[PDB]
CSV table of N, CA and C and ligand atoms in Angstrom, one decimal:
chain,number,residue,atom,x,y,z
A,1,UNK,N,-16.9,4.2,-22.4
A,1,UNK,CA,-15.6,3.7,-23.1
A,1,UNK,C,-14.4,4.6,-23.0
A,2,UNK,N,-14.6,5.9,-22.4
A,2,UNK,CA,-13.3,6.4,-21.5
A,2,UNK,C,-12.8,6.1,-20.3
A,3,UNK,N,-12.7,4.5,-20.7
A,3,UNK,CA,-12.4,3.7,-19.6
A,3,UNK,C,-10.7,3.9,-19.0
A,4,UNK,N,-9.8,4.5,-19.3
A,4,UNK,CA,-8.4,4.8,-18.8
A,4,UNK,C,-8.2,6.1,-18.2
A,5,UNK,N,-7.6,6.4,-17.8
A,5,UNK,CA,-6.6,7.7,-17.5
A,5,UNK,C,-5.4,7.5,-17.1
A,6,UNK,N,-4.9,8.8,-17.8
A,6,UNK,CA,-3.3,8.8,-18.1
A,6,UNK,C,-2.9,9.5,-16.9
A,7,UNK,N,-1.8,9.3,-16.4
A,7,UNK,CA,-1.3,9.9,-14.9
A,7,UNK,C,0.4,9.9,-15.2
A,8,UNK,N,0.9,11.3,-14.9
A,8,UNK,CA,2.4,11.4,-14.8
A,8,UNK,C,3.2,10.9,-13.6
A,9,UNK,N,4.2,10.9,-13.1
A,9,UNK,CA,4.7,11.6,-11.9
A,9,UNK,C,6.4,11.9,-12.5
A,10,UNK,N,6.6,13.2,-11.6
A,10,UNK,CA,7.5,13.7,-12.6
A,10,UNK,C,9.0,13.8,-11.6
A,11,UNK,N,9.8,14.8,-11.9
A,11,UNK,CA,11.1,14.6,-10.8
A,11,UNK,C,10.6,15.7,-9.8
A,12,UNK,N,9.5,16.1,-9.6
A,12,UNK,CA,9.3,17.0,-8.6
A,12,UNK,C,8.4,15.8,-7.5
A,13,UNK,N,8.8,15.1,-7.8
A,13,UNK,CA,8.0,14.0,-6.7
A,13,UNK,C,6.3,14.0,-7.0
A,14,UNK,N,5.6,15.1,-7.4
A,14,UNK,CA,4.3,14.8,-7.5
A,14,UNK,C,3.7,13.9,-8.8
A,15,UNK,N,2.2,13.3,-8.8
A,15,UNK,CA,1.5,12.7,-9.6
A,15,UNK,C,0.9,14.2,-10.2
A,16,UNK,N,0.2,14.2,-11.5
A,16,UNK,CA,-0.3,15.3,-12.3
A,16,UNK,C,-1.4,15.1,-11.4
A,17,UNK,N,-2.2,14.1,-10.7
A,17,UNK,CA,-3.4,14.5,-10.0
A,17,UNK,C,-3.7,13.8,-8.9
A,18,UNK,N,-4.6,13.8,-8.0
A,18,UNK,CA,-4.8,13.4,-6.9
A,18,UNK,C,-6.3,13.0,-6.5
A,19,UNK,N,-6.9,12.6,-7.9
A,19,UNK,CA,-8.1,12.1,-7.7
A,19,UNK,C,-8.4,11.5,-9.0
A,20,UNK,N,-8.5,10.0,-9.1
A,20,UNK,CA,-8.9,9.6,-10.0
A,20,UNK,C,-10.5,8.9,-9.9
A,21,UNK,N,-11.6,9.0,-11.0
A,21,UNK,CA,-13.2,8.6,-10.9
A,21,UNK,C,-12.8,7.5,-11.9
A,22,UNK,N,-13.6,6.3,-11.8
A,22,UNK,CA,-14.2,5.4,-12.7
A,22,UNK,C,-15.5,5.2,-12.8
A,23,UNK,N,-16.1,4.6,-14.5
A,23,UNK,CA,-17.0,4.6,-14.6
A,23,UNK,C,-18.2,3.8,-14.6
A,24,UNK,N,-19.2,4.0,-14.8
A,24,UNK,CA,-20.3,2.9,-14.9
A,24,UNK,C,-21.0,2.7,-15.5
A,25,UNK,N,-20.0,1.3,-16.3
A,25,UNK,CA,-20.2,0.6,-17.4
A,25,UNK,C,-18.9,-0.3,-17.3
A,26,UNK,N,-17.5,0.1,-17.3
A,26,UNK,CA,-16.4,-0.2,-17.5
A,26,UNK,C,-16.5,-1.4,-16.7
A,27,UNK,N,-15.9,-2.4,-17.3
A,27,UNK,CA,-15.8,-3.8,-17.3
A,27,UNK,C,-14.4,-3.7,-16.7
A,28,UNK,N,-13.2,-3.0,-16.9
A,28,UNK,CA,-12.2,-3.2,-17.2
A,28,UNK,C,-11.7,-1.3,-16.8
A,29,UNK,N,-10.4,-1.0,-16.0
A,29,UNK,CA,-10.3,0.3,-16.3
A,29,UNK,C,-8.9,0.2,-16.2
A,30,UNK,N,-8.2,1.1,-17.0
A,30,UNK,CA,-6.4,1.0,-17.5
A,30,UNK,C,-6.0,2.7,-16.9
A,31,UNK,N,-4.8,2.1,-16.7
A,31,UNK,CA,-3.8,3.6,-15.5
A,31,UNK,C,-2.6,3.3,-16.9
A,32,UNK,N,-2.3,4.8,-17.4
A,32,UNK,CA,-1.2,4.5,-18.3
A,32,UNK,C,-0.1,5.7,-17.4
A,33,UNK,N,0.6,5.0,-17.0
A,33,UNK,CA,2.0,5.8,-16.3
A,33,UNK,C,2.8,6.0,-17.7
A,34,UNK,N,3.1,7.4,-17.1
A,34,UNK,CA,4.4,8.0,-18.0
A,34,UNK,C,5.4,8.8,-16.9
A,35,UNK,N,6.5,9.3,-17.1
A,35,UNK,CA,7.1,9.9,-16.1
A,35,UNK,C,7.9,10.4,-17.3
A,36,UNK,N,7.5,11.9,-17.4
A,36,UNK,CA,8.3,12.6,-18.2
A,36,UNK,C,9.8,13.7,-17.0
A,37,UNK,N,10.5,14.1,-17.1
A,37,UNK,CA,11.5,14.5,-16.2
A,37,UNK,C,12.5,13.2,-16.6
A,38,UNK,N,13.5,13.9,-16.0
A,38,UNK,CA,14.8,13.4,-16.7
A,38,UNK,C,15.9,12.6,-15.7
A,39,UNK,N,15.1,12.5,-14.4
A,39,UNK,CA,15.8,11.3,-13.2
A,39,UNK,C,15.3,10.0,-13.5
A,40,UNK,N,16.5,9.0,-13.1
A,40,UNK,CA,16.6,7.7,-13.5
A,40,UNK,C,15.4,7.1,-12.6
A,41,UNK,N,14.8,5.4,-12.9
A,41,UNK,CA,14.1,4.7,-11.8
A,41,UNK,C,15.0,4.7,-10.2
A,42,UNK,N,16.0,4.7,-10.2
A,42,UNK,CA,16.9,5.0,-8.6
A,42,UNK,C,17.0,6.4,-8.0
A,43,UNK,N,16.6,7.4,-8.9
A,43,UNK,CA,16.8,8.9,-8.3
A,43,UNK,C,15.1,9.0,-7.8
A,44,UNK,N,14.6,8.6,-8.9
A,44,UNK,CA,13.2,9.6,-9.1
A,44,UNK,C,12.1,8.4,-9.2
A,45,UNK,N,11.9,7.2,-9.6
A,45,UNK,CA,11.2,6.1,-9.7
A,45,UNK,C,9.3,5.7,-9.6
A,46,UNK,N,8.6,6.1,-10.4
A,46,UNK,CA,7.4,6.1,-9.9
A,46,UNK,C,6.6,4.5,-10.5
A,47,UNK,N,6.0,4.5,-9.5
A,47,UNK,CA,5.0,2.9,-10.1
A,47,UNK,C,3.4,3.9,-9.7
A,48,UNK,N,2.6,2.8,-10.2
A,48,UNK,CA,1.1,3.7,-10.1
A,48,UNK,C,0.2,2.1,-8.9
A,49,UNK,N,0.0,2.6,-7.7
A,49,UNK,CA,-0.6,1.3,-6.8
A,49,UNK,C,-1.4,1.7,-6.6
A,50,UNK,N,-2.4,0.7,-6.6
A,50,UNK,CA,-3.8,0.6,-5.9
A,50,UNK,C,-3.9,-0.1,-4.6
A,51,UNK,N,-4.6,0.6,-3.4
A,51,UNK,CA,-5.5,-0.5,-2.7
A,51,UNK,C,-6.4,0.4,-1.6
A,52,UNK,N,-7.3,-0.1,-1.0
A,52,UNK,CA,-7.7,0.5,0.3
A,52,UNK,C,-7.3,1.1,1.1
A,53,UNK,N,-7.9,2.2,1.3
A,53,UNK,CA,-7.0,3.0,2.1
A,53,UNK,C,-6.2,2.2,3.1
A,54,UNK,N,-7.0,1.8,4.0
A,54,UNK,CA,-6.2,0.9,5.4
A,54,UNK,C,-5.0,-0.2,4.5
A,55,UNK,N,-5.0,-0.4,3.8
A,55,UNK,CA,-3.9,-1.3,3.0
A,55,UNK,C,-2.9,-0.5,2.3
A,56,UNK,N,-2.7,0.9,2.8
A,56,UNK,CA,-2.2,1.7,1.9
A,56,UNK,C,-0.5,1.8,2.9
A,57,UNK,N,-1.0,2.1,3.9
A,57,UNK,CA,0.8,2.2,5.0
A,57,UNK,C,1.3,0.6,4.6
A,58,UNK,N,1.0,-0.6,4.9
A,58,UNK,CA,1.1,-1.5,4.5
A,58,UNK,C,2.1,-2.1,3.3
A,59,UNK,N,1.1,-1.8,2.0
A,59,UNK,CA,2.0,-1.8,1.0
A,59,UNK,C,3.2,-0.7,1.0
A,60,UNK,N,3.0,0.2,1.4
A,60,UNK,CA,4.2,1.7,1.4
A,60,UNK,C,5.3,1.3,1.9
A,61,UNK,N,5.3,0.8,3.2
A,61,UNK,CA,6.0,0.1,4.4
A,61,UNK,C,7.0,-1.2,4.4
A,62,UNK,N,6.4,-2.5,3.3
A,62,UNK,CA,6.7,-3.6,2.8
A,62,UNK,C,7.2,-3.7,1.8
A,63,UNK,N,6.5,-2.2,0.5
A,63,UNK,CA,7.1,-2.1,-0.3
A,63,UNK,C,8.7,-1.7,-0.4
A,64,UNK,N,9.3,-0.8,0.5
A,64,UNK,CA,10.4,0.0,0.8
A,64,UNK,C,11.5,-1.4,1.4
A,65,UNK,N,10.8,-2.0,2.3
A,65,UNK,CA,11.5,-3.3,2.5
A,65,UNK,C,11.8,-4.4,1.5
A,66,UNK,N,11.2,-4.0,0.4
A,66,UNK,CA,11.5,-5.0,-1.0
A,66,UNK,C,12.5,-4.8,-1.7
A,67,UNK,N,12.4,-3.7,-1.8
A,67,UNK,CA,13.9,-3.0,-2.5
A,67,UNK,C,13.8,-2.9,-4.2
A,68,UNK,N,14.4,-1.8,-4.5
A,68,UNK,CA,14.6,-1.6,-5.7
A,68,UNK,C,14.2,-2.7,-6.7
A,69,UNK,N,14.8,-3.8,-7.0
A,69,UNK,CA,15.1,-5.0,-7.9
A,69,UNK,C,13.4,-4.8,-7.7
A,70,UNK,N,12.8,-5.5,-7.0
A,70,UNK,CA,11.3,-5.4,-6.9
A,70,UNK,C,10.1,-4.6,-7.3
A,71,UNK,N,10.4,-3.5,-8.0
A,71,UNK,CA,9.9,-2.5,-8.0
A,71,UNK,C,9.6,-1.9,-6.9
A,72,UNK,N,9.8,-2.1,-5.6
A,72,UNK,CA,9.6,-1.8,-4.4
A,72,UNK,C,8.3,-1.8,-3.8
A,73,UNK,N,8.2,-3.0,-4.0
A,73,UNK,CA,6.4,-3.7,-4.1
A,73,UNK,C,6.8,-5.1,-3.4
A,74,UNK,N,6.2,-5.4,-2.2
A,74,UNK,CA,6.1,-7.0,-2.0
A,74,UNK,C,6.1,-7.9,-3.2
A,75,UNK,N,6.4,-8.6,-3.2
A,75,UNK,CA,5.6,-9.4,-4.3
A,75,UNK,C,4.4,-10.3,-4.0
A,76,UNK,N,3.3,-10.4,-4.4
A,76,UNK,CA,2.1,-11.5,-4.8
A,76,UNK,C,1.4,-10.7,-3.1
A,77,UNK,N,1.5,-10.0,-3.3
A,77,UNK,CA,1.0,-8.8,-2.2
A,77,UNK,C,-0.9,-8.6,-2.5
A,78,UNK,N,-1.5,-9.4,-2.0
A,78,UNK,CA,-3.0,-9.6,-2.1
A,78,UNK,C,-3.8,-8.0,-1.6
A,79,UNK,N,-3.2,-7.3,-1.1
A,79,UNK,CA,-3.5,-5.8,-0.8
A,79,UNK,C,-3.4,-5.1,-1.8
A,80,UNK,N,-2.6,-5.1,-3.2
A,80,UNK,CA,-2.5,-4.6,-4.0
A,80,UNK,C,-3.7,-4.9,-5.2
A,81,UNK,N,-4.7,-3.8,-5.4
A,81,UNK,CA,-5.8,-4.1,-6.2
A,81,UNK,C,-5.1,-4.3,-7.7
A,82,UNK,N,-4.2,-3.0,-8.2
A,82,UNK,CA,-3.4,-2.8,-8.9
A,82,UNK,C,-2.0,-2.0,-9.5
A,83,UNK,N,-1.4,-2.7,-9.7
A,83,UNK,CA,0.4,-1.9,-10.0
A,83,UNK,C,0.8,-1.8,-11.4
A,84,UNK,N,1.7,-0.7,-11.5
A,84,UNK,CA,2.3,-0.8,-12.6
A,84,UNK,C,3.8,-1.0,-12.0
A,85,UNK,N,4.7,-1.5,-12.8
A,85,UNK,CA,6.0,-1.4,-12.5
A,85,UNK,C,6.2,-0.4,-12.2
A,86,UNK,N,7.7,-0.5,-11.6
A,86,UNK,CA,8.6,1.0,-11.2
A,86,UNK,C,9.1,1.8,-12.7
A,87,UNK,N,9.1,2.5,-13.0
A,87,UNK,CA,9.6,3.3,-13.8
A,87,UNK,C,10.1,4.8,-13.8
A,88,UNK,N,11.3,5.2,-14.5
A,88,UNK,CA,11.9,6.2,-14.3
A,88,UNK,C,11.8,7.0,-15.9
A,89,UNK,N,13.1,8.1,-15.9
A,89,UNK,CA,12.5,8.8,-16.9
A,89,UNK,C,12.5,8.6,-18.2
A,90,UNK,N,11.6,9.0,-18.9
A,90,UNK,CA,11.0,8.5,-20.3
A,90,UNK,C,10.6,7.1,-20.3
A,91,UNK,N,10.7,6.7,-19.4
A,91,UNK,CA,9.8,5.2,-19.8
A,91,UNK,C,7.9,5.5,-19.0
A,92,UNK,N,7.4,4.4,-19.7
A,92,UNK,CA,6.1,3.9,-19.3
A,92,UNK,C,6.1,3.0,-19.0
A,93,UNK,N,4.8,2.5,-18.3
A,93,UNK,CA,4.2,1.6,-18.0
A,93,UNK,C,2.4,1.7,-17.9
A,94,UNK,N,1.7,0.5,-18.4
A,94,UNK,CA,0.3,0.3,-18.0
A,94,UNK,C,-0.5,-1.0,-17.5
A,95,UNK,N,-1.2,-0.7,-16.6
A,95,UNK,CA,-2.0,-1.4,-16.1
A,95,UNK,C,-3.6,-1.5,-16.3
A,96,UNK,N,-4.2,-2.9,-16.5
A,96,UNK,CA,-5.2,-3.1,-16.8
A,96,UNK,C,-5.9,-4.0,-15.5
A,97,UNK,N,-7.3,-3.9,-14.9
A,97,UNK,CA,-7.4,-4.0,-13.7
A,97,UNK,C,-9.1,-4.4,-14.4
A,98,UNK,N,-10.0,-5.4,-13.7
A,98,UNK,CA,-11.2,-5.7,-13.2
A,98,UNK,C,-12.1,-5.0,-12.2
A,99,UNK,N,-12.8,-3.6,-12.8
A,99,UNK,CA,-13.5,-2.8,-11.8
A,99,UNK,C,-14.5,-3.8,-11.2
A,100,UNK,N,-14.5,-4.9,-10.6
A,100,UNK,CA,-15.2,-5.3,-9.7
A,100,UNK,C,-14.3,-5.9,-8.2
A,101,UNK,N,-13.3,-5.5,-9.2
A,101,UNK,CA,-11.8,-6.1,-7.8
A,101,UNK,C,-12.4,-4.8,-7.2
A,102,UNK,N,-12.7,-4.0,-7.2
A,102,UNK,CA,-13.2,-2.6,-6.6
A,102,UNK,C,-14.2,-3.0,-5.7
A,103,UNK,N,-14.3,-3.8,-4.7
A,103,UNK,CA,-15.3,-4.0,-3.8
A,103,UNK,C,-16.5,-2.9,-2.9
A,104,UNK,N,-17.2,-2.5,-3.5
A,104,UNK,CA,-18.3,-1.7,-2.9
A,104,UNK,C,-18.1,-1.5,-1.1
A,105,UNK,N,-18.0,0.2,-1.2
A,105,UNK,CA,-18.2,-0.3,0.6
A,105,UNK,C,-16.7,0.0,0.9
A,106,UNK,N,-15.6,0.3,0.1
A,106,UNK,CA,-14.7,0.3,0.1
A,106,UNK,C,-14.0,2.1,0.0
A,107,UNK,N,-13.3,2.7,0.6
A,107,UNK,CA,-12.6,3.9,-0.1
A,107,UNK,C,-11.1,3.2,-0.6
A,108,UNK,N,-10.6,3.9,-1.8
A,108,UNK,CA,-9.3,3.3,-2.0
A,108,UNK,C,-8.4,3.9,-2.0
A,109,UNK,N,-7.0,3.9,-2.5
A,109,UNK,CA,-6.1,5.3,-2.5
A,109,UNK,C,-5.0,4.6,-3.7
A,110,UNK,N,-4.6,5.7,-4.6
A,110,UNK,CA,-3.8,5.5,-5.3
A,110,UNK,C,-2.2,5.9,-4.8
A,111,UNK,N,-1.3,5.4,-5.3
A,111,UNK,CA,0.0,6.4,-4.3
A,111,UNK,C,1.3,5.3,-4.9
A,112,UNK,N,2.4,6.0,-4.9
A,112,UNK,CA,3.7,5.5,-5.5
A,112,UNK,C,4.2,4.4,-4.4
A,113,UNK,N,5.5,3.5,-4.4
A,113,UNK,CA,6.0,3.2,-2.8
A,113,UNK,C,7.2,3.3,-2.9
A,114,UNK,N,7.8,3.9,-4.2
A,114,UNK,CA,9.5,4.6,-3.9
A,114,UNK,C,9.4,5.2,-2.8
A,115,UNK,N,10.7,4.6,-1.8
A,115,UNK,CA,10.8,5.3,-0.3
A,115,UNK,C,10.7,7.2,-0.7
A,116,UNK,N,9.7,7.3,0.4
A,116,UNK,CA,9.7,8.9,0.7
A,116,UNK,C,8.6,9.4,-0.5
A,117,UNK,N,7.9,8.3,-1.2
A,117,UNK,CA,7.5,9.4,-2.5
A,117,UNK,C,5.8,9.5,-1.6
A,118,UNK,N,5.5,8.8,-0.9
A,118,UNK,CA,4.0,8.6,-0.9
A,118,UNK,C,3.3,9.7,0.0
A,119,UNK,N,4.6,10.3,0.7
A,119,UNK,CA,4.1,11.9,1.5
A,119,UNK,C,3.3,12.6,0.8
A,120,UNK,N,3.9,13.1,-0.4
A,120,UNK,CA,2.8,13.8,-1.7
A,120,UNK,C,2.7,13.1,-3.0
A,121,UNK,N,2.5,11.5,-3.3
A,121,UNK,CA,2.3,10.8,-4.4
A,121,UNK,C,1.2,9.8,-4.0
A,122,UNK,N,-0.2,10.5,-3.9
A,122,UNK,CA,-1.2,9.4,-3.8
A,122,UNK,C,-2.7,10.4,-3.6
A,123,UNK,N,-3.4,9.9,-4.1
A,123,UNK,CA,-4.8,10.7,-4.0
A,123,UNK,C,-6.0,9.6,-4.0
A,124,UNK,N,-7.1,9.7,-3.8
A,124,UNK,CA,-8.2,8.7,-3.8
A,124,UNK,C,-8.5,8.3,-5.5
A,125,UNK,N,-9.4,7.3,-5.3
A,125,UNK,CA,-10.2,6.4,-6.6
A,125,UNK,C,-11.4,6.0,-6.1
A,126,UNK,N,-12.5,7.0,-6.6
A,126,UNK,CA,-13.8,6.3,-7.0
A,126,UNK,C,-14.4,5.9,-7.6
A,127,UNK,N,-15.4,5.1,-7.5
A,127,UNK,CA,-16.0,4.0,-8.4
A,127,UNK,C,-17.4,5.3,-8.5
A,128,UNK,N,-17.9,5.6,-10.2
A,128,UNK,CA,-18.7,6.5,-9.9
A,128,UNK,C,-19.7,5.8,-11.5
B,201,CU,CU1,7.4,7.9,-6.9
């Protein structure tokens, strides 16, 4: 039933971590984005995305092509396991996600797609 983890990303471009585990039991696992630092969603902007690794240039790539207004996410983007909105500083956002969208057989990668952030804003997600 410590089914969440909280995850920052701050105005230094990085996430607080670069490996997130889930567990086995969890029906259900929740990403609570905060972004403490003091740059707006247009300076500094972080969203929290899920997908397969191989799906990961993809969304980064499409996402930057979406633009701002969008959270800088395709929209109805079927690569995306799960997202939070774009968010800047002092705000939050959370996401609630079906650990079986987690397809076995799969490696995944977590990572931002404000242009330029996903160089050092993304680390793996295991199913454990
Ligand atoms: Cu970011």
């Amino acid at each position: 039933a410590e089914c969440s983890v909280d995850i920052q990303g701050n105005d230094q471009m990085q996430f607080n971590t670069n490996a997130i585990t889930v567990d086995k039991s969890c029906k259900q696992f929740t990403v609570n984005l905060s972004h403490p630092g003091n740059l707006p969603k247009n300076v500094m902007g972080h969203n929290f995305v899920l997908s397969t690794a191989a799906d990961m240039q993809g969304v980064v790539t499409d996402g930057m092509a979406s633009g701002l207004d969008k959270d800088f996410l395709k929209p109805d983007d079927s690569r995306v396991i799960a997202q939070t909105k774009l968010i800047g500083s002092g705000e939050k956002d959370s996401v609630t996600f079906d650990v079986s969208k987690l397809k076995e057989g799969e490696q995944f990668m977590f990572f931002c797609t404000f242009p330029g952030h996903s160089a050092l804003m993304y680390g793996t997600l295991h199913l454990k």
